[PDB]
Design an enzyme around this catalytic site. Sequence first.
Site, PDB file in Angstrom:
ATOM      1  CG  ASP A  70       0.105  -2.482   6.851  1.00 52.50           C
ATOM      2  OD1 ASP A  70       1.267  -2.808   6.527  1.00 52.50           O
ATOM      3  OD2 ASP A  70      -0.304  -1.303   6.818  1.00 52.50           O
ATOM      4  NE  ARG A  85      -4.070   0.975  11.876  1.00 49.88           N
ATOM      5  CZ  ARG A  85      -4.863   1.264  10.854  1.00 49.88           C
ATOM      6  NH1 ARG A  85      -5.597   0.335  10.267  1.00 49.88           N
ATOM      7  NH2 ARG A  85      -4.919   2.516  10.411  1.00 49.88           N
ATOM      8  CD  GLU A 125       0.028  -1.574   2.910  1.00 49.82           C
ATOM      9  OE1 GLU A 125       0.829  -2.171   2.161  1.00 49.82           O
ATOM     10  OE2 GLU A 125      -0.471  -2.100   3.925  1.00 49.82           O
ATOM     11  CD  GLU A 179      -7.211   0.563   6.599  1.00 51.01           C
ATOM     12  OE1 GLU A 179      -6.676   0.636   7.727  1.00 51.01           O
ATOM     13  OE2 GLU A 179      -7.568   1.567   5.949  1.00 51.01           O
TER      14      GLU A 179
END
Lengths: 846, 38
Positions: A92, A302, A8, A96
């Site tokens: 990741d 995260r 990304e 998401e």
Amino acid sequence: GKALVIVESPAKAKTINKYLGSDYVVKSSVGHIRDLPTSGSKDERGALVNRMGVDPWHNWEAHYEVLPGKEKVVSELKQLAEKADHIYLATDLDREGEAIAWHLREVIGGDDARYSRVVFNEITKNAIRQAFNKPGELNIDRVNAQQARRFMDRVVGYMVSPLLWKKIARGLSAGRVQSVAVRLVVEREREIKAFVPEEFWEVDASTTTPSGEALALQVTHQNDKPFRPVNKEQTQAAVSLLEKARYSVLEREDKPTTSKPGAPFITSTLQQAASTRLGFGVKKTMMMAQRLYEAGYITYMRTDSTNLSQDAVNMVRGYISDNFGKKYLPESPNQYASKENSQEAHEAIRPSDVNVMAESLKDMEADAQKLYQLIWRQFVACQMTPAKYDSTTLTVGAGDFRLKARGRILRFDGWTKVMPALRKGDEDRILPAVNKGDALTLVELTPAQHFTKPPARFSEASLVKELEKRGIGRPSTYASIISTIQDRGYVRVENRRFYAEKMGEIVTDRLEENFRELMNYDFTAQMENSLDQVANHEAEWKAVLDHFFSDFTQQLDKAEKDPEEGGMRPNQMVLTSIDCPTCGRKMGIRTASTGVFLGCSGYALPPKERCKTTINLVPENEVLNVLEGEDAETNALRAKRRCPKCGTAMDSYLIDPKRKLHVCGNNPTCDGYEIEEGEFRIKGYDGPIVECEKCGSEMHLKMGRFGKYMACTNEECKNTRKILRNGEVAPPKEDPVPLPELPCEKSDAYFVLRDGAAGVFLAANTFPKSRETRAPLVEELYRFRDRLPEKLRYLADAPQQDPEGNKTMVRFSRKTKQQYVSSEKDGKATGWSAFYVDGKWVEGKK
Amino acid sequence: TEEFDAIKIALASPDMIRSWSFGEVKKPETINYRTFKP
Ligand SMILES: [Zn+2]
Ligand SMILES: [Zn+2]
Ligand SMILES: [Zn+2]
């Protein structure tokens, strides 16, 4: 072969390229390439489902779409995928990333035997090698969970927002978790404003030992009861009685104390630490953490797992053994337990290579170096031996009174060495070695006056802590909740502290009344847990979506009805005695998405008797004094007036330089208002601050059909100016002239020529919507020379091209107050100019 | 003309120099070229 890896970030592309090499081609798919529709580009239900894209009734068909400017990247990716033999999706770790990977897969096609899903928690050689060795399959369950969340949030936003526009105000928004966060902030505001500070005094005592050492103590009992004088006179009497009395150390207490290091950061803990130590809020913390991860220095940011790999534990134990040595090892690893529901497959936030010191981060900005230092210090600390303290407690008696000291002295420091305290605490001092049953000699004594603290206003990090406690949202969500509650205008953050707008109170009350199931913390937690069950593959996404949608639609269809039927109560008026400048009538206090304002009841009368006059407030800012520390919030509460009809505090906004207005906290449920000639200060409009050339007053930036235009705040002066391309501002149209034959280039509009002291400029006809401006070219002015007003004609006589054949543009020389023509190449100035010297354009180097 | 007897020199007090000046200059512009005017 050539294997294609899609990542990304571009920085993530560079970092992963560092370890992949020549065999792999890395292509950076910037953001979400494919998303639900946004712009406009039983028919009501049709239009609603087309606006949503999602159709809840037809089994959640989704109609995903690819946004303006993504198509170039989609084309490039498709070409590379046709060239490549195996396509690697290296998003990741979190949901998401899985959604992004699924979107990529579905756009490129060829699904079954051409996509490998790569999973790494850190961008490092060993991690990337282990990730590529055995790639995983795309985990469709996590994709479905992400889609379920997205669908819920779009359903609630689009279905609720027209209801709130109809009942309360246009330009509201709503959101599932967002509304519950606003509810938390509003509940704390109501607790704070309800609070009525009591008053209590305290006495402090100064003493010397027979050995000449010195000791300071605090006085806490009278007559064997708690010492807590209520007024000054009582405190002075107590001080007298104390001074008269004779003191002795009747109690001597001692005991060892140990302190363990903190657990390695989960995301919520990292945000709390960064707020408390460094002052970074949420957005800055997560942005810098994302940069540090993409550069490769820290693990994925995260996480709710405190777990550490054996590699990490061995590395850090080696570092401690080599640098600190055996006393700080200690004998075995410090274990830490995360929640049973946590993503225990994930790691904590830790350095990827413990030996990389924060100073060495050549390519990280200083704030990111500080954040890395915090992560490193915590990671090292967590495995070190506990610190060791020895503690002394003393109690001394005189007459009816007892007075106490507590002190600790520090004798092994191991984890505190790497991770020191910000400041010494009240117990971080040395009590002298008085004996058991010692004696004391006396020095003069000081009273102090205190008011009980109200419940502390949320910080960004303390709100994140509250959400983490309740289970509302998840590590990936928290930053989005904290941002969106601010962006949507229900809550504002000031003094690093959270404050709730009156509109947030109105919307909170309405949503609690109508949608009690949606707003209840337990049902929000249960929904989050059910999404987690989906990601586990314990539950079927569509099922829970249907159950949610059925309940929501029942509540909506109830809520839509009339207020007598029981629907959403309107934005009820509260009324005050003030004369409307247009019709003198009594005036009432009103809330809009713009703020809080003063309105005239004629707004509710049909056109014949309608009055649209309004008066525009400025709230008083609370200015918390950092030097007052914990007092700063209490004194703010003390500063507020209190409502006559109720105990609730009052909030303050100016109306005139002569007048100031107080409004009750429970407005409009409570109708108390106060007006004071003891006014304070009111603020007006805002924007790019400018000074009016016709009156010297402040001037501000405004929007409406004729432009983004700049207008003066003095009500006696309607001098306006305007925006243009190559300057901050431009005075009003000394001669304006439209040109239908110059089309706009960023929009479908047409250009119009204007004039002010800034110079002569082009600006689009639909000016507030288009906003497009540029300086005219000389060839353009030559083409429209006949339309030019008499004075502007000479600019069309000006040389149209420079000696290089570059095209020329018209500019104002502020140093000599005259027009000139200049040329540009690649948008930069060529350093050539030509000037008017009285009928003879003359040219040269700038 | 002034028939002075001697010359005196000293440091310049800021109020004195401000008293000399007939105005403050605040912008770097020198002379207009459109019309040769300051
Ligand atoms: Zn009126
Ligand atoms: Zn009240
Ligand atoms: Zn003005």
